[PDB]
Each structure stands twice: as structure tokens, then as C-alpha cells.
Design a protein around this ligand. Structure first.
Ligand code: MYR
Length: 195
């Protein structure tokens, strides 16, 4: 799973409804990757991946590679759902990056809600920012998939989830992107980051 003992990702989807899913994670082993590889895809300012990874802790950091589905106005949303056994309040920071420069930072809060003997954190139908909406509209008009991938080699997302009250990092996911054919549909591969 994408998860620690303290906080587990349960579901993540980005979508349009007039429901089409661009990406979708629903929730053994897990493979690994050297963070060293992907430092250049994120800022080296504060909120840089190298910095975050230093006294991390290490086991909190994951990489997701998405093969997205661009084959569909509208409502553009992002729904995520986490869970834990501790009652917490979460700060969720999403940083969109283009050529290793941060161009968007979205910061949200969610308090634990009791359900079926555990705590769930529901950040549902958060409206996708306008930068991504326009970017997606442009991207889908490209005539070849290899062009879309070329454009996407420069585009990344860094998602940091901290315990609001203690300021401890619970989860840090790096996201990288290509597109899929409609035939194959959306896919992802969750790795762990090591050093
Ligand atoms: C090919 C890219 C597909 C787009 C998928 C969006 C990925 C997650 C969005 C990042 C977090 C929220 C951003 C926002 O609400 O502005």
C-alpha cells in the first residue's frame, strides 16, 4: 500500500463529470527508487524533495507513476480519502511543478471523522485549479500520445501530508505522468523512495 502505520491512502482520483477518471488509485510487495534520480524534477528551494527527505522520515516517502487517460466545460475535481487509527487533523499540501519550478501550491485541511472503528479523512470533490484545467484542455488536443508524453516529462506533483498539530510529516508522494491508450485505460505503479 501507499501508507505508513499512522496514515494510509485509501483512494485517490482526478476526474471530470459533465464521470471520467484521468487517474485512479483504489485501496503484496513494493519496489524501490533512489530519490537521487528525481531531485531535478522538483524545486531545490525549501519544500525541495532533498530537504524534505533529510530527517524525513524515509519510510514516509513514495513515488507514483501514472499512465493517464485523456480520452473523453465540465466539473474538474480531485477526491482523496485517507485513514488512520489515531485522531488527527491533516494539512495536505499539493505542489504542481513545471520544469522543476513550483507553479501551484494548494493547501487544505481535514479533521478526522470516526467511522467503523477507525478515522477517515475525506477531501472530496476539491475543484481542480485552473492551471491544470487549461493545461488538460491543451494536452488533450495534441495529435499524438508521444507528444503528450514529451510535454509530460516536464510536469510533476509533490503531495505532503503533515499532522497539523505536531507538524510531523506523515506522507510525501511524488507523482510523474505519461498517458495511456483508452484501450489499456488508466494505470499506476507505486514505488518507495530510498537513499
Ligand atoms: C495528466 C495529468 C492528469 C491530472 C491529474 C491531477 C493530479 C492530481 C492533482 C493535484 C492536486 C490538486 C490540484 C488542484 O486542486 O489544483
Amino acid at each position: 500500500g501507499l501508507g505508513t502505520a499512522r496514515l494510509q491512502l485509501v483512494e485517490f482520483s482526478a476526474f471530470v463529470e459533465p464521470r471520467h477518471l484521468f487517474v485512479h488509485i483504489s485501496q503484496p510487495p513494493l519496489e524501490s527508487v533512489d530519490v537521487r534520480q528525481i531531485y531535478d524534477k522538483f524545486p531545490e528551494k525549501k519544500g525541495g524533495l532533498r530537504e524534505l527527505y533529510d530527517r524525513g522520515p524515509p519510510h514516509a516517502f513514495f513515488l507514483v507513476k501514472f499512465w493517464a487517460d485523456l480520452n473523453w466545460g465540465g466539473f474538474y475535481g480531485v477526491s482523496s480519502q485517507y485513514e488512520s487509527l489515531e485522531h488527527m487533523t491533516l494539512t495536505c499540501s499539493s505542489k504542481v511543478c513545471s520544469f522543476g519550478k513550483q507553479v501551484v501550491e494548494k493547501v487544505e485541511t481535514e479533521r478526522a471523522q470516526l467511522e467503523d472503528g477507525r478515522f477517515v479523512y475525506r477531501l472530496l470533490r476539491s475543484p481542480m485549479c485552473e492551471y491544470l484545467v487549461n493545461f488538460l484542455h491543451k494536452l488533450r488536443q495534441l495529435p499524438e500520445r508521444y507528444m503528450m508524453n514529451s510535454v509530460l516529462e516536464n510536469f510533476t506533483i509533490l503531495q505532503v501530508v503533515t499532522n497539523r498539530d505536531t507538524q510531523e510529516l506523515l506522507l510525501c508522494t511524488a507523482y510523474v505522468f505519461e498517458v495511456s491508450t483508452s484501450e489499456r485505460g488508466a494505470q499506476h505503479h507505486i514505488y518507495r523512495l530510498v537513499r
